[PDB]
Amino acid sequence: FACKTANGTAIPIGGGSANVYVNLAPVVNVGQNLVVDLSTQIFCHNDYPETITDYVTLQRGSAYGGVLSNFSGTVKYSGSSYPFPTTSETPRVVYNSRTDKPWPVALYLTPVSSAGGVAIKAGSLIAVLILRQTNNYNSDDFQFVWNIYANNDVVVPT
């Protein structure tokens, strides 16, 4: 089991870390959502689908910088929604193919009332998403750690 990003980088068999940049709407008001859909960026696959089933969870989701201070959020993982930052590990998604499949994670961030001005700085760390992978074969239990960086400024109009 391993993962990669679109025109980007890879995390190999056995886990590791990688940095991911995301495009963000440049202006968002109180009451509107920034949607950060990572499923167009992170893709994972099973390396032996004929004898092994891989199980993949969102173990944890954490907010940093401008998101942590100026936004409340939810996360959607494979059709279900959770608070963001997260309060527990999700149910699992099955990886049963050698073909790249998206990692179905999306952040929904809404500015808090105290947000105004540049609420997220370009190039700043906004979130960490941990992918935890296990299987039905052995005791492999691996973390794939995705550091999410803002590509651009996000302004909350006053």
Q: Which residues bind Ni ion (CB under 5 A)?
A: 47
Q: Does residue 10 belong to the site contacting ligand Z47 (CB under 6 A)?
A: no
44-103 positions binding ligand Z47, by CB under 6 A: 46-48, 51-52, 54
Nearer CB in complex with ligand Z47: 76/132: 132
Site for ligand Z47 in 130-149 (CB under 6 A): 135, 137, 140
The nearer residue to ligand Z47, 84 or 95, going by C-beta atoms, is: 95
C-alpha–C-alpha distance, residues 102 and 38, integer Å: 8
| Interface residue list for ligand Z47 (CB under 6 A) | 1, 13, 46-48, 51-52, 54, 135, 137, 140
